[PDB]
Design a protein around this ligand. Structure first.
Ligand code: FAD
Length: 376
């Protein structure tokens, strides 16, 4: 009878809705986008053990089998080189974001309410929460979950004092299709599925890995053509890049990274030169301070809404999935008669803060290490 309203049909929100349905809980998702996107995401997601367990425990079996079918293994043995190809030091599931979303959306056609942009909520005096949308509509629910991403309006209303800070580190991310030709022109360590890190003398870094991703981002999702892409990530101090790097053309971003790699091994140049000019992304890294407890209520948050101020390279998808499994389990304990609602929400929030804080800390140190090189 408790009706859970979720803002956002992203990774976390869809996983959550599957989980709640499994436990017999009434659930609706309100999503700002239309059911058919115009552009596909150009990137891949690597699923770790937390993400994998969340998917297997929440998804209907037919969705889980589709996930197993679409994913591929991506490797361990991460290698470290200097910038002159000298080796310094030496199992996840890889899937495209577009496939993962199609799999997550399957079975939710009559759960997801499309074109519903959350604007605010109000507590109703009888208990319950009134949700207002940008088109002027409203709905009433018993529990509100903000799964609405890094700039979550739900979080901004519920926990207004949580503020992001600039890390002082920025990155430029590109992809290159592993075509027959490119495969011939790159050494095997670029294509074998083990990630590589290039550690130069300069205060910056180049990370190399692989994504499964669509060749053409301008087709319907069900028609996406999925291939292997090398992904590269150039990491440096924000102050070492142009003030307006985020407004640079793809061509200027490419030029800039090549300028930073003068003298580095030619294979690294070949990779960057052969990258896709429609999918090069500059990003300024932002983080948040340690999450302190807050008083629990029938409004809560999951995913990037509470974990990641930057939608970035990292483990955001996995953490969003982890949250969804956890919140499913806690809301199920209320449905099944074992715990009070707000107490169960509190338990979720306390556990989530513990791993959230740990992960944020790890991410921050990793970013700093790209510039300082204290780990060598
Ligand atoms: C290039 C790239 C590579 C990545 N690779 C990885 C990886 O390998 N592994 C990993 O674990 N993570 C990875 N991530 C991170 C991962 O994609 C995100 O952390 C993850 O999407 C977060 O899930 P979420 O459900 O919290 O938010 P999202 O998946 O962003 O979903 C938020 C949803 O809320 C909707 N929404 C927003 N505002 C409103 C509103 N006002 N009203 C209604 N709906 C709203 C959005 O439209 C969206 O559907 C990567 C990210 C990027 C950008």
């Amino acid at each position: 009878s408790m009706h859970v309203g979720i803002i956002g049909a992203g990774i976390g929100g869809t996983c959550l809705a599957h989980g709640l349905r499994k436990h017999g809980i009434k659930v609706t998702i309100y999503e700002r986008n239309s059911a058919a996107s115009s552009i596909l995401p150009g990137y891949g997601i690597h699923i770790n053990s937390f993400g994998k367990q969340a998917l297997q425990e929440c998804l209907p079996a037919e969705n889980w089998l589709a996930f197993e079918e679409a994913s591929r293994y991506i490797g361990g043995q991460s290698r470290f080189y200097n910038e002159r190809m000298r080796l310094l030091a030496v199992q996840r599931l890889s899937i495209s974001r577009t496939e993962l979303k199609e799999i997550l959306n399957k079975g939710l056609a009559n759960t997801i309410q499309w074109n519903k942009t959350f604007v605010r909520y109000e507590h109703i005096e009888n208990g319950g929460i009134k949700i207002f949308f940008a088109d002027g509509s409203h709905e009433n629910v018993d529990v509100l979950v903000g799964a609405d991403g890094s700039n979550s309006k739900v979080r901004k209303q519920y926990l207004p004092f949580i503020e992001r800070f600039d890390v002082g580190v920025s990155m430029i991310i590109g992809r290159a299709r592993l075509t027959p030709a490119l495969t011939a022109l790159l050494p095997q360590n670029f294509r074998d599925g083990t990630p590589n890190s290039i550690v130069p003398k300069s205060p910056d870094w180049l990370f190399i890995s692989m994504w499964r991703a669509p060749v053409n981002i301008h087709v319907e999702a069900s028609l996406a053509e999925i291939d292997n892409f090398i992904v590269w990530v150039y990491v440096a101090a924000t102050d070492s890049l142009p003030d307006n790097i985020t407004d640079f053309s793809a061509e200027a971003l490419c030029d800039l990274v090549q300028s930073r790699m003068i003298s580095w091994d030619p294979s690294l140049h070949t990779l960057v030169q052969q990258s896709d000019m429609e999918n090069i992304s500059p990003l300024h890294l932002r983080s948040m301070p340690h999450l302190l407890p807050w008083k629990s209520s029938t409004v809560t948050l999951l995913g990037d809404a509470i974990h990641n101020m930057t939608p970035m390279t990292g483990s955001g998808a996995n953490t969003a999935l982890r949250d969804a499994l956890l919140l499913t389990q806690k809301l199920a304990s209320v449905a099944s008669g074992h715990e009070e609602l707000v107490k169960a929400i509190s338990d979720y929030e306390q556990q989530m803060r513990a791993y959230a804080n740990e992960i944020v800390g790890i991410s921050l140190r990793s970013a700093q290490n790209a510039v300082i090189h204290f780990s060598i």
